[PDB]
């Protein structure tokens, strides 16, 4: 059965609630983004209206084969009326097509659902600036002060400089980047751009990227692996065994692999600086873990919430343990006492 934190009170609406069968009273199912924990349950046999961004709707049609008549794409930054209630979709700074949803309830209550997001000061000059928010349904993935990581720009500068150095030293080195979902495309696009290459990948991944409305994409990617010196592989193949196997397949074109694993936060963040990160190496293979996050750090989260000043917070992540829930409630009260709302 559907948990309360996926329901929008005073409406017929649910958010990211596709794995519960028919939810009683739900007239429109919102999907914030195309990540499997959030779309879990959707298939080609789903027969209720789904409301989402254009990019998410492209993925629903081409990858999940949801039929067109049930997909309702909405433009961003635009007041829309759904089932008699005003909504706005805002960019979540997560993966391609990811949104936050503002609901303007008939009784005057305003609710923001962040979906998954990476809070940013630019959000303080969206349509959120214009009115008060009573209830915040919040992506609390990294809601504890130990969760620190660099900006996305610092992490990409590290990856560009590492790849450009290695390949300039050895023109016969291949670069490989792991992937298992949409998001984090800047990692492999930025490296291919510094190396003057397209990015090579499987037909299935090419198909997915062709749904994302990325400008000039046809100039940036390919299914011809032979022509490319940056390859994408499934994240599960980013280990010494998988990479050896891949180098075999390249027919002696290359004699070295430099590989990147974009992770979220890892405990090595509590000690090391990005500048100081080193790889794991075995022979002619090296593997870098790089902390490229598409969720808020603790500090980014706290700044957003202290700016927005909501009357009530409903967490949407880490809700399964009493210890997690108590920790998050303590920080919410700190933030509120510190800022005075
Ligand atoms: Ni996500």
From Swiss-Prot:
GO terms for cellular component: fibrillar center; nucleoplasm. Expressed in brain, heart, kidney, liver, pancreas, placenta and skeletal muscle. It is found in: Nucleus. It comes from the Eukaryota. GO terms for biological process: cell division; double-strand break repair via nonhomologous end joining; interstrand cross-link repair. Keywords: Cell cycle, Cell division, DNA damage, DNA repair, Hydrolase, Isopeptide bond, Metal-binding, Mitosis, Nucleus, Phosphoprotein, Ubl conjugation, Zinc, Zinc-finger. One of its GO terms (molecular function) is zinc ion binding. Changing residue 139 to N: Impaired nuclear focus formation, reduced interaction with PIAS and increased sensitivity to cisplatin. Induction: During mitosis. The mRNA encoding this protein contains an internal ribosome entry site (IRES) in its 5'-UTR. This 5'-UTR generally suppresses translation while specifically promoting expression during mitosis, when cap-dependent translation may be impaired. Its main location: nucleus. May be required for DNA interstrand cross-link repair. Also required for checkpoint mediated cell cycle arrest in early prophase in response to mitotic spindle poisons. Possesses beta-lactamase activity, catalyzing the hydrolysis of penicillin G and nitrocefin. Exhibits no activity towards other beta-lactam antibiotic classes including cephalosporins (cefotaxime) and carbapenems (imipenem). Belongs to the DNA repair metallo-beta-lactamase (DRMBL) family. Binds constitutively to TP53BP1. Binds CDC27, which is itself a component of the anaphase promoting complex (APC). Binds PIAS1. This is DNA cross-link repair 1A protein.
């Amino acid at each position: 059965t559907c948990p309360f934190y996926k329901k929008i009170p005073g409406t017929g609406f649910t958010v990211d609630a596709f794995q519960y069968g028919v939810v009683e009273g739900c007239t429109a199912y919102f999907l914030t983004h195309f990540h499997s924990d959030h779309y879990a349950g959707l298939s080609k046999h789903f027969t209720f209206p789904v409301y989402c961004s254009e990019i998410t709707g492209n993925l629903l049609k081409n990858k999940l084969h949801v039929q067109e008549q049930y997909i309702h794409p909405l433009p961003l930054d635009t007041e829309c009326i759904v089932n008699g209630v005003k909504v706005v979709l805002l960019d979540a700074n997560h993966c391609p097509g990811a949104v936050m949803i503002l609901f303007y309830l008939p009784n005057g209550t305003v609710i923001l659902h962040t979906g998954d997001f990476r809070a940013d000061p630019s959000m303080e000059r969206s349509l959120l600036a214009d009115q008060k928010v009573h209830m915040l349904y919040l992506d609390t993935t990294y809601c504890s002060p130990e969760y620190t990581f660099p900006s996305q720009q610092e992490v990409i500068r590290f990856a560009i400089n590492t790849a450009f150095e290695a390949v300039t030293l050895n023109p016969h080195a291949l670069v490989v980047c792991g992937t298992y979902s949409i998001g984090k495309e800047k990692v492999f696009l930025a490296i291919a751009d510094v190396l003057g290459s397209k990015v090579g990948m499987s037909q299935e991944k090419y198909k997915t990227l062709q749904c994302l409305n990325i400008p000039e994409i046809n100039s940036l990617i390919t299914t011809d692996m032979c022509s490319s010196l940056v390859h994408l592989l499934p994240m599960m193949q980013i280990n010494f065994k998988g990479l050896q196997s891949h180098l075999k397949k390249c027919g002696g074109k290359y004699n070295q692999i430099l590989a990147f694993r974009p992770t979220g936060w890892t405990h090595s963040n509590k000690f090391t600086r990005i500048a100081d990160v080193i790889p794991q190496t075995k022979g002619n293979i090296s593997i870098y873990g790089i902390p490229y996050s598409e969720h808020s750090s603790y500090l980014e989260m706290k700044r957003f919430v202290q700016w927005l000043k909501p009357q009530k917070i409903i967490p949407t992540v880490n809700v399964g343990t009493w210890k997690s829930r108590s920790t998050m409630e303590k920080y919410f009260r700190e933030w509120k006492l510190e800022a005075g709302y």
